[PDB]
Enzyme design. Structure first.
Site, short mmCIF file in Angstrom:
data_model
loop_
_atom_site.label_atom_id
_atom_site.label_comp_id
_atom_site.label_asym_id
_atom_site.label_seq_id
_atom_site.Cartn_x
_atom_site.Cartn_y
_atom_site.Cartn_z
N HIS A 41 0.77 -1.26 0.17
CA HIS A 41 -0.06 -0.03 0.07
C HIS A 41 0.96 1.17 0.16
O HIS A 41 0.46 2.49 -0.02
CB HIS A 41 -1.04 -0.05 1.29
CG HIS A 41 -0.45 0.12 2.35
ND1 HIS A 41 -0.48 -0.80 3.48
CD2 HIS A 41 0.31 1.29 3.06
CE1 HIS A 41 0.19 -0.20 4.63
NE2 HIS A 41 0.36 1.09 4.33
N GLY A 143 2.76 6.22 9.67
CA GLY A 143 4.10 6.25 9.19
C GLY A 143 4.78 4.97 9.82
O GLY A 143 6.02 4.62 9.63
N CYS A 145 3.91 1.78 9.44
CA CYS A 145 3.74 0.63 8.38
C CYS A 145 5.17 0.07 7.95
O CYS A 145 5.77 1.26 7.83
CB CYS A 145 2.48 0.93 7.40
SG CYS A 145 1.14 0.58 8.00
C1 LIG Z 1 0.88 2.03 9.24
C2 LIG Z 1 1.36 3.55 8.47
O1 LIG Z 1 2.16 3.62 8.39
N1 LIG Z 1 0.10 3.97 8.01
C3 LIG Z 1 -1.31 4.13 8.78
C4 LIG Z 1 -2.44 3.08 8.53
C5 LIG Z 1 -2.31 2.44 7.23
N2 LIG Z 1 -2.67 3.45 5.96
C6 LIG Z 1 -2.93 2.92 4.90
C7 LIG Z 1 -4.19 2.19 5.28
C8 LIG Z 1 -5.59 2.98 5.45
C9 LIG Z 1 -6.50 1.97 5.73
C10 LIG Z 1 -6.82 0.83 5.53
C11 LIG Z 1 -5.74 -0.01 5.35
C12 LIG Z 1 -4.56 0.63 5.13
C13 LIG Z 1 -3.13 -0.26 4.69
C14 LIG Z 1 -1.41 4.54 5.82
C15 LIG Z 1 -0.35 4.21 6.30
#
Ligand SMILES: *CC(=O)N1CCCN(Cc2ccccc2C)CC1
Ligand SMILES: *CC(=O)N1CCCN(Cc2ccccc2C)CC1
Lengths: 304, 304
Positions: A41, A143, A145
């Site tokens: 993603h 951030g 992830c």
């Molecule tokens: C983990 C991170 O860096 N982020 C915040 C949550 C994940 N997001 C992408 C997203 C949003 C909604 C559902 C699934 C996902 C993978 C952005 C980055």
């Protein structure tokens, strides 16, 4: 003596963390040999996250669109592929700090250390368990992830987790390093409710063993029980059912403390039926279930 | 989201840990520049530990009696001195992995990460607080002496603790890196009882702020109190007295959550007077006091 929620030294994994930028999205990658692993993603905007078609989105991307930074030096991307929910970026340089490692898919109940990261920079390290509902109760901000969960055996890092998703309930979902989600979770912004968060019974019994070994023994009783009798109590309290395998695994702790597994089960039973009566065990007012028998043996032996 | 007992990445400190052997005694040392710091009782047998005269014992020792191993390579000791309760060993090689560092003597209430070590090998990392009675509630087995507590600001390691002693009650005593004990403890095998382990009130309030920020708000009430009124309750429950300095430090958390410090104090008061009624806050059945306001801001902002 004393018992602490203890993570692996994070050094070996600190040397592997990089920053991955695709257009405007930035998250963490894991640089092992000449491959950087990140959540797929990375190629999405929040506009994509409602119903992303990752194959179609990735067609629009090229090797030069994946900006990989290791400290303040840029890695050249010479290839890219999608494996399940991870991207593998082939770089033209092997990470000189690559430790001995494996990718292992853990089972629910198993514990691991998380190195929380932001822009490829480690911020902190804590101990987790894969919950029986295949969530982890992490501490993860936007951030984070790409942050990874790991175990260390002497010199060998077993990566079991990459962080991908936070459920509306504030618990965490992610993949092994082959990009396969633990539990039924999909990297999409959709209705995804977690199952019952059951208690990891064998880990509670291990923790009661740790308590006895460190002097906390008020909860030891005169009773015993049977696997079937104990499990009736387990079910009532949303405890995972205890198997003969669990008993076998508790054998060494049993041997060290001279308390039979089924006697300790009877101690746990009375604790479930009566609660702590405002008392504490290893400085906790509830039953801790994120120490494996292996974790208890380690912290009560002193493996390095 | 989610809140975890979080340690600093231990990498920078892993690169500093060595093994120090004097005759038959082995413990951990800290190699910074061309100096290895270890506990001075490295020169003792348990026969010495009842009434050691360290000056007299050290006369019998020479540079070649201090065997310093860094991994599987030996460091040449070209000098040795006693500073309070630490030995400084001058080696002929600067540690190439020396991070930016300071030695800082922390105050009670302040938190730090411990890297637990055995034979110069890191085993695990956890988060501690200097208790108001100048003990720490560690997890330390025999051979763990020389393990250090530290804080990290971006690139700079502030070493605040070296592990030396376990009290008969299974709590831990040690020195700053100038070899001065926190509290009245002496590196001798004698009757040494810890004072009252009071609760770090400002850290509990910070943790209640963390809870609100992560969704746990059942304990928020309609009441307020005064510093003097709250402190009457604090005293009764062996909570450290809350000062205007503590209130000032809670200002940013106050600002973020829109809950006045004295309102949150009133929430804490009702929690002390009524207990949790079998409920939990950030997955804890008691009031956590080993998160500083600074720790809460960090884990709820995402500093690296
Ligand atoms: C983990 C991170 O860096 N982020 C915040 C949550 C994940 N997001 C992408 C997203 C949003 C909604 C559902 C699934 C996902 C993978 C952005 C980055
Ligand atoms: C910390 C460690 O490696 N050791 C166990 C406890 C300390 N011990 C020496 C000792 C014994 C009694 C009282 C004080 C001290 C310093 C041996 C090493």
């Amino acid at each position: 003596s004393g018992f602490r929620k203890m993570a692996f030294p994070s050094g070996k994994v600190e040397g592997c963390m990089v920053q991955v930028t695709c257009g405007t999205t930035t998250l963490n990658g894991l640089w092992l040999d000449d491959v950087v692993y990140c959540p797929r993603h990375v190629i999405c905007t929040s506009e994509d996250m409602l119903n992303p078609n990752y194959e179609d989105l990735l067609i629009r991307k090229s090797n030069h669109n994946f900006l990989v930074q290791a400290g303040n030096v840029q890695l050249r991307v010479i290839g890219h592929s999608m494996q399940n929910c991870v991207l593998k970026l082939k770089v033209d340089t092997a990470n000189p700090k690559t430790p001995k490692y494996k990718f292992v898919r853990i089972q629910p109940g198993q514990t691991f250390s998380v190195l929380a990261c932001y822009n490829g920079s480690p911020s902190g390290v804590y101990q987790c368990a894969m919950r029986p509902n295949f969530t982890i109760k992490g501490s993860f901000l936007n951030g984070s992830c790409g942050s990874v969960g790991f175990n260390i055996d002497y010199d060998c890092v077993s990566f079991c987790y990459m962080h991908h998703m936070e459920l509306p309930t504030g618990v965490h979902a992610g993949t092994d390093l082959e990009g396969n989600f633990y539990g039924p979770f999909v990297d999409r912004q959709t209705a995804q409710a977690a199952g019952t968060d059951t208690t990891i019974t064998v880990n509670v019994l291990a923790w009661l063993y740790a308590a006895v070994i460190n002097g906390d023994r008020w909860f030891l009783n005169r009773f015993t029980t049977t696997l079937n009798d104990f499990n009736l109590v387990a079910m009532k309290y949303n405890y995972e059912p205890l198997t003969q395998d669990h008993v076998d695994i508790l054998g060494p702790l049993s041997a060290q403390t001279g308390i039979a597994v089924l006697d300790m089960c009877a101690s746990l039973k009375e604790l479930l039926q009566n609660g702590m009566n405002g008392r504490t065990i290893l400085g906790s007012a509830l039953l801790e279930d994120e120490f494996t028998p292996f974790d208890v043996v380690r912290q009560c032996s002193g493996v390095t």
